[PDB]
Amino acid sequence: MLFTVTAPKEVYTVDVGSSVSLECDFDRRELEGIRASLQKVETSLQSERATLLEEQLPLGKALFHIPSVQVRDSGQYRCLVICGAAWDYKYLTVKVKASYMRIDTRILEVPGTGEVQLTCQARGYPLAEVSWQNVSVPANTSHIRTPEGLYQVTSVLRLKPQPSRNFSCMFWNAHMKELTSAIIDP
Amino acid sequence: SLTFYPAWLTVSEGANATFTCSLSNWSEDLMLNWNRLSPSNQTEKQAAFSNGLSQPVQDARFQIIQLPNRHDFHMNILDTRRNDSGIYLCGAISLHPKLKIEESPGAELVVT
């Protein structure tokens, strides 16, 4: 046979908590004996997360649906199609993202020092950087991983409170090319 | 496991080049593909060997020959051209008892 599989799109970028539909096309000219599958490659076992949408097979498309994609679903996959005594495959990459959209803020006065302590905290993916707008004093920024694999990023700024000044913490998610921010009025 | 050697091969245009794909286990139901890597490391099928026959995808210069010991195969590019330069591998599939796919490491061809 002349049987081949093609992948029109090699990289899928997916919001955490939304679905993907990973696609490989195949040569219909080269139906009962067709076997299409998806493996996650990490070993490469068959995916238990993806459902083959088998109604697309007649159109020459192997489409695999994964609901509610999580950080652990990121990585490389192999679509495989076997047709009689022939087979072919392609690799696909799922990149995941989660916007740092919910930013929790806190204001406290630090006992003894007279300084104020400002905190911003947000969860997202991949790792964000934080800066504070028009502030010369560096903040202390750190992260942990959440049970679902997100980053929880916390930035803490300690300084003498200057009159009528609001402070804005800016989360930069480089991979998303996204800036999100929150304003703190002390 | 599969090996694909030599890891590097350099020949002049017109040479009939050979890589050897060597399988730890041979079975009559095994199907063997010869792939080329794209610039993004995607696999692209060049030829296949199944049921004792070599089948090229789109260029008949790509020929697979099973050697007498059944486990070694010559992956031959007849009449090499500069455009053949790239990375290649071999891949095997078995269906029984369970599904199993293995790939060799890549090998680089340079045609000058």
From Swiss-Prot, chain A:
It is found in: Cell membrane. GO terms for cellular component: plasma membrane. Expressed in immature and mature bone marrow-derived dendritic cells and splenic dendritic cells. Highly expressed in placenta, liver and weakly expressed in heart, spleen, lymph nodes and thymus. Also expressed in some tumor cell lines of lymphoid origin. Residues 3-95 form the Ig-like V-type domain. Residues 2-186 are extracellular. One of its GO terms (biological process) is negative regulation of type II interferon production. Changing residue 49 to S: No effect on PDCD1 binding. Residues 99-180 form the Ig-like C2-type domain. Its main location: membrane. Disulfide bonds join 24-79, 120-169. Coiled coil: none annotated. It is a single-pass type I membrane protein. The keyword Signal applies. The keyword Disulfide bond applies. Keywords: Adaptive immunity, Cell membrane, Disulfide bond, Glycoprotein, Immunity, Immunoglobulin domain, Membrane, Receptor, Repeat, Signal, Transmembrane, Transmembrane helix. Changing residue 61 to S: No effect on PDCD1 binding. Glycans are attached at residues 134, 140, 166. Changing residue 65 to A: No effect on PDCD1 binding. Belongs to the immunoglobulin superfamily. BTN/MOG family. Involved in the costimulatory signal essential for T-cell proliferation and IFNG production in a PDCD1-independent manner. Interaction with PDCD1 inhibits T-cell proliferation by blocking cell cycle progression and cytokine production. Interacts with PDCD1. This is Programmed cell death 1 ligand 2. It comes from Mus musculus (Mouse). The lineage of its organism: Eukaryota, Metazoa, Chordata, Craniata, Vertebrata.
UniProtKB/Swiss-Prot annotation, chain B:
Residues 1-112 are extracellular. Thymus-specific. Ubiquitinated via 'Lys-48'-linked polyubiquitin chains. Deubiquitinated and thus stabilized by USP5. It comes from the Eukaryota. Disruption phenotype: Mice grow and develop normally but exhibit splenomegaly, selective augmentation of IgG3 antibody response to a T-independent type II antigen, and enhanced proliferative responses of B-cells and myeloid cells by anti-IgM and granulocyte colony-stimulating factor stimulation. Mice are prone to development of autoimmune diseases. In a C57BL/6J background, mice spontaneously develop lupus-like autoimmune phenotypes, characterized by proliferative arthritis and glomerulonephritis with predominant IgG3 deposition. It is found in: Cell membrane. Disulfide bonds join 21-90. Residues 37-44 are annotated as: Interaction with CD274/PDCD1L1. Residues 1-106 form the Ig-like V-type domain. Monomer. Interacts with CD274/PDCD1L1. Interacts with CD273/PDCD1LG2. Interacts with FBXO38; leading to ubiquitination and degradation by the proteasome. Inhibitory receptor on antigen activated T-cells that plays a critical role in induction and maintenance of immune tolerance to self. Delivers inhibitory signals upon binding to ligands, such as CD274/PDCD1L1 and CD273/PDCD1LG2. Following T-cell receptor (TCR) engagement, PDCD1 associates with CD3-TCR in the immunological synapse and directly inhibits T-cell activation. This is Programmed cell death protein 1. It comes from Mus musculus (Mouse). The lineage of its organism: Eukaryota, Metazoa, Chordata, Craniata, Vertebrata.
